[PDB]
């Protein structure tokens, strides 16, 4: 202000040097200013003086600052653009005739900054032609600014005002084929806005498009890699759709210019149907364009109801039809493929409309030779039985047209695939809905009365076979072979299996146990496994091992069941707002609970209620306000719960949003009506004495139930197939528990149970921001994820876990990380910082996890004498603590003692536990001192809390655990058998197996009654194993390898004999797997549940938790995968020399150098699932900047680990690169000295 007046007086002067000094001072004052700092700055007086100063001719230096002053004034105070916009004539005059290029560039920058809010003034000022008249003389930035000005001016245009762009259209059209990204983007925006504004004027559209714009944009859309981005691709395709719809002549013109080839290339790919994966919006826009290029349907006939559910192309079709025939033949296949592989209410509807118009406007032969290698009848039958009264009408119309055009071909297919049956069902079983119901009824009645009125070796045969699976009647094994023949070699349909009761009968056959059944369940299961799969018949088990090979019939049955389930399912997918949710806020009223009244009565009325706020905020506000006392105070605010909230008879959890609290316990009413919340202040030890062990559980017996499990609530027409598939998967996983001797192998790997439609629906539902942000995921998805997880792959279940297991902030962060494409979502998370020392890492880690281990905020770890902080040290913390937890001194796991490779100064000589099958806990007997047990238990508790915290923060650990460990984690420790000893102790398992080879012989020989006591005794004593008898072995009741663990009391003077050997084996297995490793896992479970419950890990199998906790499996890299995600820039544009040498040199390691490189760059010696392509910041490679004296050869590379930024010198050889990339990775580790 005070200096502002002095500067204004300096501006209003005569001496040129005074003006120059004043303008430099004013620019300097404006640059560092701000809205608060520069309050009261005179804009009504400074601006006119600056304009008068700019209106000169005698100097080429004062103007470069006069323009800068106005630019900076607009930048600093975004409200001076009401007095600033008065020298548009002056800027345009300077643009008209050029004297200094820099003055023109600055004028362009000022105009670009002004156009964001005032474009109409520039438009009536005639700047559109003036900016582009000398477009070829400026530099890159001035050209970009000029095109931005053109776009912003053409955003708001009127039909009356067209001469401002009429003479400038050819320049932009010729500019549309440049190699610069941003110029192309701006020109395409200009064209899109022009077309949108001129949509109701056919003549103006013809003027704009002409015949060169179409050509240029057509080859713009095809070039790969794409110059355009996704959003601009969508905009350009929408421009095509709007242009074709509003004027049919350009639709004809594009149809005559082989647009079909471009659409085919965009959809499927290449010109030699594997569709290229694209976002739903792009597919919707392309389908809309395909639909628009086709003639429109008549408004009479059976199409009269479309008026209630809410030319030139036809002339060309009546003309030479070769073009139309080529179009239909080229596009029908891709249209059907898109329709059958997309789950969305818009894409499906658009594809359906396109299919109707294609079928209607084609003739007999074209439909005959297009609809050949396709299944249309099944789709029509599936879509008839739907709740929405749009798809039903579409299906009826398709059926009518197909019957009229091709009666002979489509008269057996409809009967075999259940279309006539569904039409008869519709024709026998507040005004628009009634009218469309009446139309549906009349149309179905007419169709039935006309086409299928008066009227087979597969349906009858299937009925005969399924009538022999009744429980009350014996069926032998002929029914099963008949069913196998029908399933494997026939043309049975999904409707026939429904009509002839097969799934229910088979389910009852496999999963029934009563007293009126004519055959026991065990014999039935063994007959099933003998017919499908090749297990022995009941009562005929061979002496050897049951290891059948063939599994084809079970796979065929699984595939048929999956197809039937896909055909029959009718699950809903809800996708669709954000601005409304982020703007409006909820309203609530507080009323005291009548039963108890001790706190003060509320009288304020409405309460500040954010939609995503937690009830903890309400409790804190009540405590601070003084209602909690039985002025604002912070002592109470600065855990123990003193107040509680209730709604009706339902308790409100503390970790619940107010929106969900209103929605569930108490829609337009949620955001309109006022709600009320009440507030109120808050044994003989048999194992040790006798020697008996608990029995082994059979996991299959809980799956073999006919009724649905208690977790299933939804009602769908495909529940029976889901239950049957669940039973079959249970049989496939657990079939060796039914035979005494069998090999532990799955009949069918679990990757072959994946359904291709439920996965698509789940993936689509897991992309809508609003449902993730509110928490409205449909019940069927979670219920199927927890009950039948084999339908979905691993990524879908992982995303579902991360979305439904934690708060909304973590869900939104995961969504943003996975889908970078996206009223804007913005997560808000807290962060806690802690400092550690690299000399007592375990103790300080334990303290950290005891204090902030269970908190709901992100944790970042910094070090004492280092200047690095962020996401690198945090990952290194886990990577080092996990390595520390494997020391041999602690005495926790099994295995051998090894020494690490490339250690630190003090890490040398430290023994680490190594095991080539994984890590499992050591057994502790009944004589262990309490101190040792307590130490082991506290270490295990810390480990459990560490993993539970690492999972929640999206970090990765480096601990190679074993399969029995995860079985214990998932509460499956009661079903462990001798097969699992190969994962803990290879050498004991062989002895156990050879000894189990003797008990079977002993039992078999004792089962023979044609002998005497002396003969029995001699035969039992004669049994030998590898030349030595059980007495010659000379063992005892001590667990093998550990001669201090007693199986039972007195196990030192009790030798194992042939009479008591089964007890010895059972005790050995139990003490090795469950008994001695119980106290050490109870502490782990207690620690893990301190963060979040273990019950949220039910989406995964024991063999899938390794990828969730640690990284992906090791793999050898190659240049192909490296040159698809690595992004080189800043001196190393692609196909350079340094990048080539580097890509050659990484793909030669042995996973140890891979670990070193990953630790050096990323900070953790692991990668997320998916490899390099899954890293959110791609590995960026840049050129290191040196001087002219020092050679850029005897230096070392550098890395910013927070963003994977690799700075790399331009070496003169590959040997030098090899010898100077290893020194950095080996001698430059465990340090953050540059941040």
């Amino acid at each position: 202000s005070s200096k502002a007046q002095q500067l204004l007086q300096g501006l209003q002067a005569s001496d040129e040097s005074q003006q120059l000094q004043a303008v430099i001072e004013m620019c300097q004052l404006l640059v560092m200013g701000n809205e608060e700092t520069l309050g009261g700055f005179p804009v009504k007086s400074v601006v006119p003086a600056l304009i008068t100063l700019l209106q000169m001719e005698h100097n080429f230096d004062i103007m470069n600052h006069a323009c800068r002053a106005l630019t900076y004034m607009m930048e600093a105070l975004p409200r001076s653009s009401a007095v600033v916009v008065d020298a548009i004539p002056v800027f345009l005059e300077k643009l008209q005739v050029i004297q200094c290029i820099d003055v023109a560039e600055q004028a362009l920058t000022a105009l670009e900054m002004l156009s964001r809010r005032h474009s109409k003034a520039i438009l009536q000022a005639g700047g559109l032609a003036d900016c582009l008249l000398y477009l070829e003389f400026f530099s890159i930035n001035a050209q970009r600014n000029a095109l931005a000005i053109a776009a912003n001016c053409c955003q708001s245009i009127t039909p009356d005002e067209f001469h401002f762009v009429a003479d400038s259209l050819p320049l932009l059209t010729q500019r549309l084929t440049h190699q610069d990204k941003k110029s192309v983007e701006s020109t395409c925006l200009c064209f899109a806005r022009l077309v949108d504004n001129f949509q109701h004027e056919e003549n103006l559209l013809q003027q704009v498009a002409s015949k060169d714009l179409l050509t240029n944009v057509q080859q713009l859309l095809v070039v790969t890699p794409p110059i355009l981005s996704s959003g601009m691709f969508i905009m350009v395709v929408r421009m095509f759709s709007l242009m074709c719809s509003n004027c049919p002549t350009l639709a004809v013109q594009l149809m005559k210019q082989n647009i079909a080839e471009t659409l085919h290339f965009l959809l499927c790919g290449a010109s030699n149907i594997d569709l290229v994966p694209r976002s739903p919006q792009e597919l919707y826009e392309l389908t809309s364009l395909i639909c628009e290029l086709m003639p429109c349907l008549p408004k009479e006939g059976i199409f009269a109801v479309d008026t209630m559910l809410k030319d030139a192309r036809a002339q060309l079709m009546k003309e030479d039809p070769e073009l139309a025939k080529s179009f239909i033949k080229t596009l029908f296949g891709v249209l059907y493929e898109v329709y059958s592989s997309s789950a969305g209410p818009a894409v499906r509807h658009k594809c359906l409309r396109a299919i109707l118009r294609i079928i209607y406007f084609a003739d007999a032969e074209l439909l005959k030779d297009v609809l050949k290698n396709h299944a249309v009848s099944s789709h029509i039958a599936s879509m008839l039985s739907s709740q929405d009264l749009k798809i039903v009408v579409g299906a009826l119309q398709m059926a009518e047209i197909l019957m009229q055009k091709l009666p002979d071909i489509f008269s057996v297919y409809f009967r075999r695939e259940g279309v006539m049956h569904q039409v008869k069902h519709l024709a026998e079983s507040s005004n628009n809905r009634e009218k469309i119901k009446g139309w549906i009824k009349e149309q179905a009645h007419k169709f039935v009365e006309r086409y299928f009125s008066s009227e087979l070796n597969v349906l009858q045969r299937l009925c005969a076979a399924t009538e022999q699976l009744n429980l009350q009647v014996d069926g032998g094994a002929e029914c099963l072979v008949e069913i196998r023949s029908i399933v494997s070699e026939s043309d049975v349909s999904s409707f026939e299996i429904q009509h002839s009761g097969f799934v229910k009968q088979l389910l009852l056959y496999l999963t029934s146990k009563s007293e009126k059944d004519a055959v026991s369940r065990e014999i039935r299961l063994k007959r099933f496994l003998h017919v499908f799969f090749s297990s022995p018949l009941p009562g005929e088990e061979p002496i050897g091992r049951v290891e059948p090979v063939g599994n084809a019939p079970l796979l065929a049955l699984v595939h048929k069941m999956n197809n039937c389930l896909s055909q029959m399912e009718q699950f809903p997918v809800k996708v669709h707002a954000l601005k409304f949710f982020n703007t409006h806020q909820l309203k609530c009223q507080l009323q005291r609970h009548p039963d108890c009244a001790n706190v003060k009565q509320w009288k304020g009325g409405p309460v500040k209620i954010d939609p995503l706020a937690l009830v903890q905020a309400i409790e804190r506000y009540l405590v601070v306000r003084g209602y909690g006392r039985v002025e604002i105070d912070e002592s109470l605010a600065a855990v123990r719960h003193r107040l509680q909230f209730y709604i009706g008879e339902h308790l409100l959890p503390y970790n619940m949003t107010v929106y969900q609290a209103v929605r569930q316990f108490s829609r337009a009413g949620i955001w309109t009506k006022t709600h009320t919340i009440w507030y109120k202040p808050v044994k003989h030890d048999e194992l040790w004495h006798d020697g008996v062990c608990p029995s082994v559980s059979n996991p299959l017996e809980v799956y073999l139930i006919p009724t649905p499990p208690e977790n299933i609530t939804f009602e769908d027409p495909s529940l029976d197939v889901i239950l049957l598939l669940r039973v079959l998967h249970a049989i496939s996983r657990y079939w060796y528990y039914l035979y005494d001797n069998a090999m532990c192998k799955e009949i069918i790997p679990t990757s072959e149970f994946i359904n291709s439609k439920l996965t698509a629906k789940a993936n689509r539902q897991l992309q809508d921001p609003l449902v993730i942000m509110t928490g409205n995921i449909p019940t069927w998805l979670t219920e199927l994820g927890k009950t039948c997880p084999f339908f979905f792959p691993f990524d879908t279940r992982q995303m579902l876990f991360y979305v439904t297991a934690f708060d909304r902030d973590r869900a939104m962060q995961r969504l943003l990380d996975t889908n970078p494409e996206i009223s804007r979502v913005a997560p808000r998370l807290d962060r806690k910082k802690r400092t550690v020392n690299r000399e007592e890492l375990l103790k300080q880690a334990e303290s950290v996890m005891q204090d902030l281990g269970s908190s709901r905020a992100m944790l970042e770890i910094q070090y004492e004498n280092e200047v690095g902080t962020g996401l690198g040290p945090t990952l290194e913390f886990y990577a080092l603590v996990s390595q520390e937890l494997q020391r041999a001194d602690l005495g926790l796991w099994r295995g051998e003692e090894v020494t690490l490779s490339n250690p630190k100064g003090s890490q040398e000589g430290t023994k680490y536990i190594q095991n080539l099958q994984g890590l499992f806990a050591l057994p502790f007997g009944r004589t262990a001192k309490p101190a040792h047990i307590a130490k082991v238990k506290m270490k295990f508790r810390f480990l459990g809390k560490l993993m539970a915290k690492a999972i929640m923060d999206f970090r990765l650990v480096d601990l190679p655990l074993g399969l029995p460990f995860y079985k214990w984690m998932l509460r499956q420790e009661t079903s462990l058998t001798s097969h699992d000893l190969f994962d803990i102790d290879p050498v004991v398992a062989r002895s156990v197996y050879h000894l189990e080879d003797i008990v079977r012989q002993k039992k078999r020989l004792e089962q023979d009654k044609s002998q005497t006591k002396e003969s029995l005794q001699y035969a039992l004593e004669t049994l030998t194993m590898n030349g030595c008898s059980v007495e010659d072995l000379g063992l005892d009741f001590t667990l093998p390898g550990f001669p201090n663990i007693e199986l039972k009391k007195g196990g030192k003077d009790i030798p194992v004999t042939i009479h008591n050997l089964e007890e010895y084996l059972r005790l050995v297995i139990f003490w090795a797997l469950n008994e001695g490793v119980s106290r050490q896992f109870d502490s782990f479970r207690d620690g893990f549940e301190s963060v979040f419950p273990l019950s949220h890990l039910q989406y995964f199998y024991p063999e899938e938790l390794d990828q969730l906790l640690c990284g992906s499996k090791a793999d050898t890299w190659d240049a192909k995968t490296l040159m698809e995600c690595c992004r080189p820039d800043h001196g190393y544009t692609h196909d350079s020399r340094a990048v080539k040498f580097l890509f050659e040199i990484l793909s030669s390691f042995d996973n140890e150098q891979q670990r070193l490189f990953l630790q050096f760059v990323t900070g953790s010696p692991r990668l997320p699932v998916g490899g390099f392509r899954s890293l959110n910041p791609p590995l960026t490679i840049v050129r290191k900047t040196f001087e002219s004296t020092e050679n850029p050869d005897d230096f070392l590379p550098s890395v910013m680990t927070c963003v994977n930024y690799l700075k790399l010198p331009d070496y003169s050889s590959i040997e030098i690169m090899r010898e100077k990339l290893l020194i950095a990775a080996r001698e430059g580790q465990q340090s953050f000295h540059l941040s």
Partner: protein, 74 residues
């Protein structure tokens, strides 16, 4: 390896240790991590100019012990 000083209006001195080939956006992210200001309200000023994203420090000839300014926008 060079050290620079970032100074705010209230009066501080954040000593950032960076390298010439670093991106300005990374510097703004580090300032966010060290002070908490979101990396969208910042407007760095050097030699009476306004630094722009997408460039490197070596483009503007930033050297040892060069003082920048951090002016926030609302």
């Amino acid at each position: 390896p060079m050290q620079i000083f970032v100074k705010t209006l209230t009066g501080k001195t954040i000593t950032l240790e960076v390298e010439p080939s670093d991106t300005i956006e990374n510097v703004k992210a580090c300032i966010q991590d060290k002070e908490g200001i979101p990396p969208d309200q910042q407007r760095l000023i050097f030699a009476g100019k306004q630094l722009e994203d997408g460039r490197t420090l070596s483009d503007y000839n930033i050297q040892k012990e060069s003082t920048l300014h951090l002016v926030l926008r609302l």
